[PDB]
Design a protein around this ligand. Structure first.
Ligand SMILES: *O[C@H]1[C@H](O)[C@@H](N)[C@@H](O[C@H]2[C@H](O[C@@H]3O[C@H](CO)[C@@H](O[C@H]4O[C@@H](CN)[C@@H](O)[C@H](O)[C@H]4N)[C@H]3O)[C@@H](O)[C@H](N)C[C@@H]2N)O[C@@H]1CO
Ligand SMILES: [Mg+2]
Ligand SMILES: [Mg+2]
Ligand SMILES: [Mg+2]
Lengths: 51, 84, 88, 129, 63, 211, 220
RNA sequence: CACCAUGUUCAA
RNA sequence: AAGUGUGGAGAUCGAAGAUGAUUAGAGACCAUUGUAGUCCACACUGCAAACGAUGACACCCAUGAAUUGGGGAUCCUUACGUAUCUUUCUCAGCACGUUUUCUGUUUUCACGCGAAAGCUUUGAGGUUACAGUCUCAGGGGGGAGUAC
RNA sequence: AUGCUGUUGCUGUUAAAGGGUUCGUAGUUGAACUGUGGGCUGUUCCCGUCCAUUCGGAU
């Protein structure tokens, strides 16, 4: 019952996801990663940086 | 990944690394170059691994120096590699 | 038409066994690492169909570490998994 | 030093086939070792193979299809009369049903089954099954 | 082959002649299936018991 | 496995999908490198970390999903994690997809000791790590269970059939690979549709230190 | 009664898996000896004890003694199984080897020496099997040869359905623990050798636990 | 780091 | 290595031997010595656990740290990544870093093998599915490496 | 019986056994190549022009 209570208190998420708050500042990839993302069939994604 | 090695038609990355006799067909590493003398300026053909010390036939000077591998050309000389 | 016959054309042996799709190795009855993997054939809208592509791998090939290289080589041949990106 | 080039080639095929490879690189090659492989193609134990030209002895890249269990070379090349085929089948072959003993005869390099039909004898080269 | 047509038709002949194989068995693979009681049934001690001329098989060997 | 029989582009990675992978750092490998995962590396970055090819990540991700979606009775998939960072993600993948799940010490004999009362017989094992789940994999070698694994750059790939390359180390990186696989298996089944985004937040897949 | 625990024994008890070669096809471990005597008919399955010998463990204050019993099982139509268990009483280890020999049941490929005319009289190729140093080699024999073997391999080869065979044995055959299990390893290899009959491509099937997954969930 | 050698014959 | 011959040398350690001591005895260990020897020259010997208790020459053979010398770069993909610090003369230098590759001495690691211990591109693997070439030795323990 | 004489067919790290190392004759073994021909006739997707902007669409 303390395990059934704290399993309900833990399964709670904010309205904005931690991934949606991560894109909204920019993902800021590395040199090698950005040099890879030119090669893809989708190109370099939007909301990106090069650091 | 996702491309498998074909032993008949190996990758340029795989094949450039290999020893010259460990290639699929063995071949040279060396080449010829057209060396211009530092004074005197006349062109000479110098082998890349010239263990002898080649002389300028016009200048009378020696524009190469043997090493353990590739021979070292003198300072101030111009050279471009010849094909084949 | 697989397995030995009689000269009267009746299939004499019991149990024609499976063969590895990577190494063509006949899978024995005690080879308890030998697995079948069913991959869902999927349609144009990205939802699975009622048909699956099944590929079976021998037990020694999983034992060494070389099964994952073999599942790649099969699914490129079957056309299941793409070999490279398209051009940008 | 390398003594028998055919015994070298069949040993590298048999070794790479028990390892389950997809291709072998055979070095050096001969006219004998390609005539041995073309016996192994006709009864479908190997796939397509390719002879690379050096101005040396060549190299052969053989595509394996999983069907070969063991190929080997009998050294020295013992002389085999026509009455001696059933003796060589019981010694080096696993069964009378499958498996071939390759011989070099006057008519060519053939397996044991063809040479029995053409009523010829030869020196034994090797086997494949 | 000459040694199988001759001399393979001799061994099938003596099986049919002495009662080792009935006349349906003609393929030569039935000689490989003969047993020791298949031969012992053809002794005169056995037929004189089987034809009915004696009460027991030890009556037949006496007579 | 983003190649369908007709030839559509329905399964392929999109600029929204790959933007999530870059944000959650699930393409950064560790410093070390093994032979079997060497084909999945694109290149090495400065500070010596390995970068994983996002094509081969996505092709092995969808290939593992085309295997999980082709399982009627989804309880025959068992997904398991001995490392602590996985256990919350293992629970939420099991909730949306409907698979068995196990966390913590594996308790040997779960797959082989048949008179135990914790005896299960899955058809597909999904391990979070090939290394910390060595015991789950080694019993799958005994009772004919193929293995799906989230492999890092140095992974022992004996008995692993579909090795997914990712970053299984960090808390956000793990769970993003379970969100995206749960997001995908539900698409292949037809539960959710591919047009609208899957509303369910990734945050519940993340492990959170309850003390 | 017999309540099964494994999914294979649930399907054998429900007659969903009907024959024993449906288990051999998918490389499944048996794990329950009631599977075998259900699938094989009861009168067409013979067993008898190969060897019983005592093995001792030196302890403080004397020796511990347990008897190691060998059993062989199989109808004489291509199924063979050998199991070796141990026990304090000789009656327990004989009973435990019966349980063990059915779990190790395995098929025997049989073939022809010369022409093919009926049921196979012999093994289809030369095969050896090695346990310890004792390796026995089994060679195909002609149609009316018989089993030419030592009386410990000969009793195993009778239960495996092989009617005519040549046999060699290379080293320390008076150790019957390894002589028994080397005849078993050699007959087990008869479905391991890829012959040009089996070169053809066969269409894949579905596991009995794949196909009947909806029925097995109804036992829970 | 003083000295500290040995226990008849078979059998259980 | 010991040993031998003829010359040198002769410091130290030191078979033999001598004294102490320990011990039931001590012909031993321990302490003090001390001859031949140790060391060199020129001859002789040819006796090792002279070992990896593993004959030589080729072939194939999975993986990850290193190390020594030389060389080179900074539906099976048409190619690509470079730092550090010493520098008025055996100095167009030296060392390092990342990566190739040849040769050598190895190490924890896939098959396979072995009675096992273990071996494993450095085979003891590629072997009853037994043939690349040559060579030497063995055939229960002794007597006996003895006698002639 | 004895693959305990081994050509088939034995062993040699530890069970008996690789000889201290090189050179070396008799001996045995020894790399590739000069070629086996030809003619006729039988035998639904995806790639763009209209919508939308960290996730779509008719085509
Ligand atoms: O000849 C070499 C061979 O061509 C190559 N296969 C290589 O194998 C490895 C390589 O292993 C060695 O790692 C050593 C460094 O720790 C390196 O040695 C080298 O060191 C450099 C710096 N001193 C050189 O200057 C030096 O000349 C060179 N000996 C390598 O040899 C690894 O580095 C690779 N990561 C993987 C390769 N497979 O080894 C052969 C000689 O061992
Ligand atoms: Mg006394
Ligand atoms: Mg004292
Ligand atoms: Mg002194």
């Amino acid at each position: 019952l303390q395990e059934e209570e704290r399993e309900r208190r833990m399964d709670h998420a904010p309205a904005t996801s931690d991934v949606d708050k991560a894109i909204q500042s920019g993902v800021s990839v590395d040199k090698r990663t950005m040099q890879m993302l030119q090669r893809l069939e989708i190109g370099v994604p939007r909301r990106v940086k090069r650091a | 990944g996702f491309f498998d090695a074909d032993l008949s038609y190996p990758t340029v990355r795989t094949e450039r690394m290999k020893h010259k006799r460990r290639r699929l067909v063995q071949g040279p590493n060396s080449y010829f170059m057209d060396v211009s003398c530092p004074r005197c300026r006349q062109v000479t053909v110098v082998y890349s691994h010239a263990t002898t010390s080649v002389e300028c036939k016009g200048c009378s000077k020696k524009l190469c120096r043997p090493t353990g591998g590739k021979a070292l050309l003198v300072e101030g000389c111009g050279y471009r590699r010849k094909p084949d | 038409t697989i397995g030995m016959f009689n000269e009267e054309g009746e299939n004499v042996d019991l149990y024609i066994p499976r063969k590895c799709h990577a190494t063509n190795t006949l899978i024995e009855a005690h080879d308890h690492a030998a697995v079948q993997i069913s991959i869902a054939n999927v349609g144009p809208n990205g939802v699975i169909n009622g048909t699956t592509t099944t590929l079976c791998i021998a037990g020694y090939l999983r034992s060494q570490g070389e099964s994952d290289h073999a599942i790649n080589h099969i699914t490129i041949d079957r056309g299941i998994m793409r070999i490279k990106t398209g051009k940008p | 030093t390398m003594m028998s080039v055919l015994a070298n080639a069949l040993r590298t095929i048999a070794s790479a086939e028990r390892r389950g490879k997809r291709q072998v690189l055979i070095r050096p090659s001969s006219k004998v070792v390609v005539k041995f492989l073309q016996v192994m193609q006709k009864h479908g134990y190997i796939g397509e193979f390719e002879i690379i030209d050096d101005h040396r002895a060549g190299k052969i890249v053989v595509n394996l299809n999983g069907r070969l269990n063991k190929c080997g070379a009998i050294c020295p090349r013992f002389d085999c009369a026509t009455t001696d085929y059933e003796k060589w089948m019981k010694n080096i072959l696993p069964s009378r049903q499958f498996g071939f003993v390759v011989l070099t005869t006057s008519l060519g390099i053939m397996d044991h089954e063809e040479a029995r039909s053409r009523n010829t004898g030869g020196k034994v080269l090797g086997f494949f099954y | 082959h000459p040694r199988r047509l001759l001399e393979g038709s001799a061994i099938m002949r003596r099986c049919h002649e002495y009662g080792f194989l009935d006349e349906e068995k003609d393929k030569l693979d039935y000689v490989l299936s003969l047993t020791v009681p298949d031969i012992l049934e053809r002794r005169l001690q056995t037929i004189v018991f089987k034809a009915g001329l004696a009460k027991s098989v030890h009556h037949a060997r006496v007579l | 496995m983003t190649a369908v029989e007709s030839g559509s582009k329905v399964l392929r990675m999109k600029e929204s999908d790959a933007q999530k992978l870059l944000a959650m750092r699930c393409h950064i490998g560790t410093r070390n490198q093994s032979s079997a995962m060497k084909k999945y590396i694109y290149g090495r970055t400065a500070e010596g970390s390995h970068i994983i090819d996002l094509h081969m990540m996505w092709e092995k991700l969808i290939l593992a999903a085309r295997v999980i979606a082709a399982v009627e009775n989804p309880k025959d998939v068992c997904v398991c994690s001995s490392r602590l960072y996985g256990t919350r993600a293992i629970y939420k993948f099991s909730q949306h997809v409907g698979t068995s799940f196990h966390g913590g010490r594996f308790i040997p004999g779960t797959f082989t000791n048949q008179i135990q009362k914790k005896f299960v017989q899955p058809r597909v094992l999904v391990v979070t790590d090939p290394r910390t789940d060595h015991q789950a994999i080694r019993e799958a070698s005994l009772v004919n269970i193929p293995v799906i694994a989230l492999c890092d750059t140095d992974a022992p790939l004996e008995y692993v059939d579909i090795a997914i390359p990712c970053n299984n180390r960090g808390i956000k990186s793990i769970g993003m690979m379970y969100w995206l696989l749960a997001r995908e298996v539900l698409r292949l089944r037809g539960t959710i549709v591919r047009s609208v985004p899957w509303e369910e937040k990734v945050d519940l897949f993340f492990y959170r230190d309850p003390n | 009664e017999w309540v099964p625990c494994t999914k294979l024994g649930r399907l054998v008890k429900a007659q969903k898996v009907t024959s024993l070669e449906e288990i051999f096809l998918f490389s499944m471990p048996i794990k329950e000896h009631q599977i075998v005597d259900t699938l094989i008919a009861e009168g067409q399955l013979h067993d008898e004890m190969m060897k019983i010998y005592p093995v001792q463990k030196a302890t403080s204050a004397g020796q511990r003694t347990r008897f190691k019993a060998f059993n062989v099982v199989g109808d004489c139509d291509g199924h063979i199984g050998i199991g070796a268990r141990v026990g304090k009483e000789v009656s327990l280890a004989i009973r435990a080897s019966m349980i063990a020999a059915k779990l190790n049941i395995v098929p025997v490929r049989r073939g022809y020496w010369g022409n093919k005319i009926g049921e196979p009289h012999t093994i289809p190729m030369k095969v050896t099997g090695k346990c310890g140093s004792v390796a026995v080699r089994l060679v195909p024999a002609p149609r009316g040869t018989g089993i030419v073997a030592a009386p410990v391999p000969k009793k195993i080869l009778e239960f495996a359905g092989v009617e005519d065979v040549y046999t060699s044995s290379r080293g320390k055959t008076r150790t019957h623990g390894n002589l028994i299990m080397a005849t078993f390893y050699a007959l087990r290899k008869t479905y391991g050798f890829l012959t040009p009959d089996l070169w053809a491509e066969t269409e894949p099937s579905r596991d009995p636990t794949d196909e009947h997954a909806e029925l097995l969930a109804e036992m829970t």
